[model samples]
Target: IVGGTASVRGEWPWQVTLHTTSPTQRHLCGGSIIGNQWILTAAHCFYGVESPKILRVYSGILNQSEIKEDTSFFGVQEIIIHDQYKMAESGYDIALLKLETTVNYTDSQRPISLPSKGDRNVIYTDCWVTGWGYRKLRDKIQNTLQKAKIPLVTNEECQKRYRGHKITHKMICAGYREGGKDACKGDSGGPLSCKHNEVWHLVGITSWGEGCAQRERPGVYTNVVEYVDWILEKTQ
Candidate 1:
């Protein structure tokens, strides 16, 4: 995350890191623990990757180096990308991964709450985004997780900033006007969470943006509320 701070332990238990299932284990994207066996991420994360076997998930850890000592990893059993998803700009950029094993709930690993149908029109503020994305537009990936509080942008204003690009209703934008902070490279599929009654709810899935963090160009994400029913139906 650009213009963000390092997250403390247990501050975001739902946050997870995703990597390619290989000996090299390339760090690719970030995800959220939606259920013990379900992970919520962006469909674009698996672009050109046809098999779920190629993906690996790591939870309950903050540093990427810890994966060497942490033997436990939730193997993916199935991947469910939205049928309507074509590309990042198309807006149905959501996906789900079913784990081979149920994750043990702990202070460092747990599922975040999903919004209900009644929350579709509710406005949210003070929302924050966490990821290991680049700190700047061309910087390398971060080892420690980073987080920053970004304000949500209205569709009208968002569309104005991203002219010629369709700001679909299923997408949400968040960032500062001066552009000091935002989700950048390697942060795709991460959770964009907001607190409600002291409980964190998964509001958006990090999708795409014009650049890392630029003035008037906020990071766009898949509006999780728009696909609540789709998620429930698929995971059921």
Candidate 2:
């Protein structure tokens, strides 16, 4: 959200920071709290890791730099990435993280509901992508949560625009036709939430893109409906 401003305090309750065990304590990915112990993110976040490292999930906070008592941090108990996930591809890049303990829900920390499996047509719908990623590509990552309103690009438009690339039903694209705002570094695994029937549903998981804020290269996300059964099965 380079062109965007700071998010209202507690405006994004489900947003969470995906942290690794490295000495830098870097927060590389963004995710959403889907259940008491389940976190929805991108499979690529855990790529190349053979062993489980210490992963801290910081949720229900606006600023990542400031850790308040209400900033709920949880140890990752398990990481369940999509079985067919490939790092070199465009689709099949979603994952789930099981928390060692339940996240404390408040006005600032709550779970977002998923869309009903049958309701997958979200093309052109007004949506928002929230994350604490860098405003600029290859720049510093932001500590405060940021959000921007972008529209879902239909498969037809995506196919026409990105002819050579793969655009599967399992994936959705979102951004302006002019490419003013989009997800950047550290925004992967974040939620692309859209409202339907007057209720907000988690429709997309921030997956990948060509470059940060590029025209004709909208941010791609893993369509939640395409993997609803998989998510439900693992969480169950």
Candidate 3:
């Protein structure tokens, strides 16, 4: 979260931090644990990056600078980015990370559920966006996880604002008509989840935006429902 408060520890069990450092870990982006070993994220985060050996996926931790035994790190067995993603202005910016080892689920660590094929047609209303992204444009990424509640904008409204150009049904927009709260740099590849009929659903993957919380330019996300087939194909 860019303009949000610190999130409570273990508040989001499925949240995962994507790191690109070695013995000393550092955050590159955010993700959601979809399975014991599969992580969902943005494709552009690792589009041109080929060195997965140095990448690490950390789970069950809220603070990046803190040391906690419950926090576990896993090696990347492989990264499967969408074949349609080419770092272009177009959409289809989703990816999955295969962990080297399975995660041991705990109170602070668990997998989030994905929407069923029938439910995929449903649109989200309000949702939670979580990450350890930059607090401000010039500021550095935070050391603690944070979150912001945003209203899911309709596709018609989203595309209308962007001139219906690059915006596609493959993407979903969330944020607000008023600015000051949204995902920013480093928040990419995080989750935009919301409860549906009492159960939370992974609806979107943080992808891009005009700027952090800028009015009329709300955050854009890769619609997860549109990529269910791609995800199952890669994960399976």
lDDT of 3 by residue, 100-151 (tens): 9999889987888887768856666659999989877767878889988999
- Whichever of 2 and 3 has more lDDT, that candidate is 3
Once fitted onto the true fold, the runs of candidate 3 whose alpha carbons sit more than 4 angstroms away are 22-25, 67-72, 121-123
Question: Which ten contiguous residues of candidate 1 have the minimum total lDDT?
Answer: 19-28
Total backbone clashes of candidate 1, pairs 3 or more residues apart or in separate chains: 0
Off by over 4 Å in 1: none
Best by TM-score: 1
Q: Write the per-residue lDDT of candidate 2 for residues 1-236, one digit (tens) a residue.
A: 64556798878788888877565467878999899899999999887455445688887668777765454579888888888887725678989999989877789779989877667554437688999888888887787789988888777787777777889888888877888799888888999988777677889888877788888878888988878889999999
The TM-score measured for candidate 1 stands at 0.96
User: What is the Å distance of residue 47 in model 3 from its true position?
Assistant: 4.1
Q: If both were scored by TM-score, which would come out higher, candidate 1 or candidate 2?
A: 1
Compute the lDDT of residue 14 as modeled in candidate 2.
89
